[PDB]
């Protein structure tokens, strides 16, 4: 319809990307491909690599917060198991 | 007139024609750019340029005779035109050039000069000629891993790789007696029939040409030589065609002729044709049409080539043409069949009976090598009057209905749908 305002992209043919020249692509007509043959092996290798690149980012924060929750709970058993009779006073006073 | 053929190793075929008065004689080999490994493609064109480098001075100075050559895929020929009374000296030069002497021609400095000239020519072709480059890339991407996709003039690295060893190997392995045929198109009758069968006129290497293992194939693919600096956009399509010596060649030719060609800037070409021309005339879409049916010994290529400037509507331009192909494969009117018959008769009579004997000799050699005898105009007309709407429908059902296609493009092809929206427009409608 009517032209729009300022934009960082357009439509097909005039998207607005950087000018480039010298790139060649290909394709193999997926009908004549027989696409998947080692799907289980591909999945195994991809999962291995993805886990290899992200060791600590999942193991560390969950571990530290499990430790924090464990500390809170164990303080609770030091208090809230037939023992509050002699520590609730010092907690609340 | 009718042609006469005989064969004792060498085949002598003549098409006598008193209408013309420029006798010609040459040699057509059955091996071209389709029988060479991709190690160094540029050998046949290198030989062609070698023949077109220094013997031109010899033929011009010694007597009156002009020589020319052309190699496309397997019609490698070296035609030597002449005057009607100079066929003897023409064959004398041919004999002195292609058996002995064959050493002074392959001089070193001459070889590097020819190599530089060929490198410059191929670089110029790659830089400038887009409409033929897209077709060459279509050939390259339609026959992947097969000696039918490599370009007919080679690549830069292929030309710069080898020097003399593989050239002489090609000469020894493909310039033989098995697949060599002489031609006598022009204004001669029977002297060619005898002069070729002579003690002095023999061809070296009376052996056999090596046979390839993987003959040919066809798989859909894409190539996108996207150079957005170029103003226009050149794209092409192709479907598995039909080789020569098949009882459907004329049917495919008529199917190609039905849609025909079109030029936007020519008023005559804008005022005829079929429904798709009106559909693309309503909203301007493209400038050129070229419906082709390329046929070689091993396989064929029936497709579509075009060039457009309205880069935004490439999808519409492709969609209309594919829908018209589907209309052809579902329902054809007899009036367009009759007009296609007449147009094909006109174009084939123009092509097979042009005034230049060089083209006639090339066609005669191409027919003789893989046929054994040329098919005259009358028989072609007889075989084309039998083409019917049912035959065209049955043929298009097998070839144009859910078959692999290959697209080659360059320029500004941002709007070109990659592979699925361009292939799923054949059998996914309300059939
Ligand atoms: C009160 C309803 C009355 C009928 C409604 C008709 C419209 C039905 C669809 C309703 C909205 C669905 C949302 C998506 C619609 C677009 C689908 C689309 O784009 O898919 C194809 C188009 O699908 C269609 O819609 C095509 C059929 C047109 C139908 C026209 C109206 C028919 C009305 C009869 C009833 C239809 C509904 C039946 C429901 C069971 C694309 O292929 P193409 O052929 O357009 O691409 C060609 C390309 O350029 C390359 O060649
Ligand atoms: C994202 C969130 C929304 C999800 C859905 C958005 C996409 C809408 C559907 C797009 C599919 C499409 O467009 O299908 C397009 C195809 C054909 O068009 P074509 O291009 O394949 O062939 C055309 C070019 N050659 O027709 C259909 O299949 C119509 C659907 C048929 C099956 C249902 C029939 C209705 C019965 C009741 C079913 C009720 C459910």
């Amino acid at each position: 319809g009517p032209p729009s305002g300022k934009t960082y992209m357009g439509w097909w043919g005039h998207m607005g990307g950087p000018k480039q020249k010298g790139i060649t692509s290909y394709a193999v007509s997926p009908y004549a491909q027989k696409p998947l043959q080692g799907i289980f092996h591909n999945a195994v290798f991809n999962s291995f690599r993805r886990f290899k690149s992200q060791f600590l980012y999942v193991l560390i924060p969950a571990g530290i917060y499990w430790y924090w929750w464990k500390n809170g709970n164990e303080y609770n058993e030091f208090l809230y198991s037939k023992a509050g009779r002699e520590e609730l006073e010092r907690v609340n006073v | 007139a009718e042609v006469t053929q005989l064969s004792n190793g060498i085949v002598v075929a003549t098409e006598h024609n008193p209408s013309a008065h420029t006798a010609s004689v040459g040699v057509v080999f059955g091996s071209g750019a389709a029988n060479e490994n991709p190690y160094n493609n540029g050998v046949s064109n290198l030989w062609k340029n070698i023949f077109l480098s220094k013997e031109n001075s010899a033929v011009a100075a010694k007597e009156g005779l002009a020589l020319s050559s052309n190699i496309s895929r397997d019609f490698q020929s070296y035609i030597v035109s002449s005057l009607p009374g100079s066929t003897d000296k023409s064959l004398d030069f041919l004999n002195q050039s292609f058996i002995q002497q064959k050493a002074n021609l392959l001089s070193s400095s001459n070889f590097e000069a020819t190599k530089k000239s060929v490198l410059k020519q191929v670089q110029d072709f790659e830089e400038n000629d887009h409409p033929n480059r897209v077709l060459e890339h279509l050939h390259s991407t339609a026959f992947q891993n097969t000696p039918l996709s490599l370009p007919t003039r080679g690549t830069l690295e292929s030309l710069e790789n080898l020097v003399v060893a593989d050239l002489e190997s090609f000469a020894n392995n493909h310039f033989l007696n098995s697949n060599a045929v002489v031609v006598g198109t022009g204004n001669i009758k029977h002297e060619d029939l005898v002069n070729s069968i002579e003690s002095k006129n023999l061809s070296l290497q009376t052996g056999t040409k090596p046979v390839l293992k993987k003959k040919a194939a066809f798989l859909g693919s894409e190539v996108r030589l996207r150079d957005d600096t170029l103003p226009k956009a050149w794209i092409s399509l192709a479907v598995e065609g039909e080789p020569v010596n098949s009882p459907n060649y004329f049917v495919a030719k008529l199917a190609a002729q039905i849609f025909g060609s079109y030029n936007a800037f020519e008023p005559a070409s804008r005022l005829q044709g079929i429904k798709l021309l009106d559909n693309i005339q309503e909203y301007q879409l493209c400038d050129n049409f070229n419906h082709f049916s390329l046929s070689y010994k091993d396989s064929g290529l029936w497709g579509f080539s075009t060039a457009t400037r309205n880069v935004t509507m490439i999808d519409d331009l492709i969609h209309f043409t594919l829908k018209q192909w589907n209309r052809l494969t579902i329902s054809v009117t007899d009036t367009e069949v009759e007009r296609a018959k007449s147009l094909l008769k006109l174009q084939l009579g123009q092509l097979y009976e042009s005034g230049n004997p060089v083209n006639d000799a090339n066609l005669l050699g191409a027919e003789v090598l893989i046929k054994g005898s040329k098919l005259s105009l009358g028989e072609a007309f007889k075989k084309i009057d039998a083409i019917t709407v049912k035959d065209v429908k049955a043929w298009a059902g097998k070839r144009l209905w859910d078959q692999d296609i290959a697209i080659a493009g360059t320029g500004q092809i941002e709007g070109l749908l990659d592979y699925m929206r361009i292939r799923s427009d054949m059998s996914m409608m309300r059939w």
Side-chain angles (χ1 to χ4, degrees):
Chain A
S4 301
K6 181 53 68 54
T7 181
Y8 298 113
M9 65 179 288
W11 215 241
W12 283 112
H14 64 91
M15 289 206 260
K19 184 172 311 323
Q20 48 81 27
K21 156 183 173 183
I23 297 290
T24 62
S25 81
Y26 300 103
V28 288
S29 178
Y31 271 96
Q33 204 153 344
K34 194 181 208 185
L36 276 299
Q37 212 277 346
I39 176 59
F40 63 93
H41 179 275
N42 189 359
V44 159
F45 204 110
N46 290 318
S47 188
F48 277 173
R49 191 190 44 79
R50 280 300 150 81
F51 267 46
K52 193 184 285 289
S53 160
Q54 272 67 21
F55 291 166
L56 73 165
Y57 301 135
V58 181
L59 189 139
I60 299 300
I64 78 164
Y65 273 10
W66 164 270
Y67 210 101
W68 192 4
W69 200 81
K70 158 170 285 186
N71 292 137
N73 214 7
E74 61 86 20
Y75 177 46
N76 281 120
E77 288 90 7
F78 279 101
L79 175 64
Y80 281 154
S81 78
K82 214 193 171 273
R85 193 79 75 172
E86 79 267 352
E87 277 93 7
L88 291 174
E89 293 87 20
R90 64 141 191 71
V91 176
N92 210 359
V93 179
Chain B
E2 212 56 60
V3 300
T4 64
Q5 283 95 326
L6 74 165
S7 306
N8 169 22
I10 52 173
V11 187
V12 193
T14 314
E15 184 164 9
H16 176 74
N17 213 21
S19 301
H21 52 283
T22 61
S24 76
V25 62
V27 174
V28 184
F29 290 108
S31 190
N35 289 347
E36 211 271 327
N37 45 2
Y39 191 22
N40 45 355
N41 191 351
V43 296
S44 69
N45 62 342
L46 172 43
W47 258 107
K48 176 193 128 167
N49 290 265
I50 281 169
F51 184 31
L52 267 51
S53 66
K54 193 41 69 203
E55 318 101 311
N56 300 60
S57 85
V59 298
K62 281 162 186 63
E63 279 94 14
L65 72 165
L67 59 87
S68 43
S69 170
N70 51 300
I71 297 95
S72 196
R73 291 291 167 159
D74 54 357
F75 320 120
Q76 160 157 287
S77 55
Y78 308 91
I79 300 106
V80 179
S81 158
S82 177
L83 276 177
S86 62
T87 79
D88 202 323
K89 43 176 73 153
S90 190
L91 61 84
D92 200 319
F93 160 70
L94 271 163
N95 183 67
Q96 300 306 322
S97 172
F98 291 167
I99 51 150
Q100 49 95 31
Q101 66 281 355
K102 277 210 71 78
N104 75 332
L105 174 58
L106 276 296
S107 300
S108 66
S109 69
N110 281 109
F111 163 69
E112 289 88 6
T114 303
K115 192 172 158 306
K116 300 306 172 329
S117 167
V118 168
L119 276 181
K120 171 180 60 75
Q121 281 193 358
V122 67
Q123 184 57 269
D124 181 347
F125 181 76
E126 166 59 45
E127 293 178 351
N128 309 350
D129 198 312
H130 303 294
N132 304 327
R133 191 181 75 222
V134 288
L135 183 63
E136 202 89 350
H137 272 106
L138 192 44
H139 282 115
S140 289
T141 198
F143 302 119
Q144 286 178 0
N145 302 268
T146 290
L148 205 70
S149 64
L150 72 165
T152 178
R153 271 178 318 289
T155 75
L156 280 299
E157 62 259 20
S158 302
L159 277 296
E160 57 84 25
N161 274 321
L162 276 296
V163 286
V164 181
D166 216 349
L167 184 139
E168 211 51 43
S169 83
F170 192 94
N172 285 312
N173 299 328
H174 298 289
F175 290 166
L176 283 72
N177 185 29
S178 50
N179 50 345
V181 169
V182 301
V183 194
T185 317
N187 195 355
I188 51 174
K189 187 70 181 294
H190 187 273
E191 294 82 48
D192 182 25
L193 279 296
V194 193
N195 270 325
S196 167
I197 310 282
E198 274 274 326
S199 56
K200 60 199 166 302
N201 293 108
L202 266 75
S203 285
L204 207 69
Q205 210 82 1
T206 64
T208 187
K209 159 169 90 72
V211 54
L212 73 165
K213 171 202 161 183
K214 175 69 210 95
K215 310 165 164 55
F218 202 94
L219 56 91
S221 281
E222 300 262 330
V223 287
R224 301 185 153 216
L225 268 290
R226 195 189 144 165
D227 305 290
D228 63 358
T229 317
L230 319 173
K232 297 170 73 172
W234 297 267
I235 72 159
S236 297
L237 273 76
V239 178
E240 158 82 358
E242 292 179 352
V244 185
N245 286 259
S246 163
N248 281 264
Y249 178 45
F250 295 112
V251 192
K253 184 64 66 68
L254 187 134
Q257 182 48 74
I258 279 176
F259 302 111
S261 175
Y262 158 64
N263 197 354
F265 298 102
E266 281 289 333
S269 285
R270 206 211 289 275
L271 295 174
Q272 50 97 21
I274 209 164
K275 279 84 187 165
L276 62 93
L277 183 56
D278 291 331
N279 207 335
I280 74 164
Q281 274 322 115
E282 183 175 7
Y283 295 96
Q284 183 34 251
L285 284 197
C286 66
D287 313 326
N288 303 66
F289 280 162
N290 280 117
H291 269 83
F292 54 81
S293 69
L294 309 164
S295 45
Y296 324 113
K297 178 180 77 45
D298 299 330
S299 178
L301 201 80
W302 182 89
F304 162 46
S305 165
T306 182
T308 184
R309 216 198 297 106
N310 181 267
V311 183
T312 316
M313 282 145 189
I314 319 297
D315 60 352
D316 302 343
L317 167 62
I318 285 300
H319 161 65
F320 284 145
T321 300
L322 269 298
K323 287 326 164 154
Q324 293 285 117
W325 287 3
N326 287 174
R327 212 191 49 82
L328 174 78
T329 199
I330 190 167
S331 59
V332 192
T333 180
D334 50 356
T335 180
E336 85 183 40
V337 164
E338 161 60 47
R339 79 170 283 271
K341 279 186 212 180
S342 54
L343 283 195
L344 195 156
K345 284 185 200 186
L346 170 82
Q347 84 170 4
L348 188 152
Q350 285 162 351
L351 160 68
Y352 283 60
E353 271 315 327
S354 278
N356 218 359
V358 162
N359 301 115
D360 214 322
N362 260 316
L363 297 152
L364 188 152
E367 290 293 321
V368 160
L369 267 298
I370 62 186
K371 284 264 189 72
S373 195
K374 186 181 176 60
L375 181 139
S376 163
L377 273 297
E379 282 87 352
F381 295 140
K382 184 272 301 173
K383 294 183 186 294
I384 199 172
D385 312 308
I387 300 314
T388 56
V389 56
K390 297 286 100 176
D391 212 1
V392 173
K393 274 188 186 174
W395 173 87
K398 316 310 155 175
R399 295 297 192 180
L400 268 46
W401 190 251
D402 291 331
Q403 282 293 112
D404 44 357
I405 71 180
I407 296 90
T410 195
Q412 308 168 2
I413 58 154
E414 293 83 3
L416 174 57
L417 304 167
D418 60 357
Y419 202 77
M420 291 325 286
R421 212 170 302 272
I422 191 167
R423 196 202 193 284
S424 87
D425 61 352
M426 282 196 206
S427 185
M428 223 65 55
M429 71 298 282
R430 190 50 154 106
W431 182 257

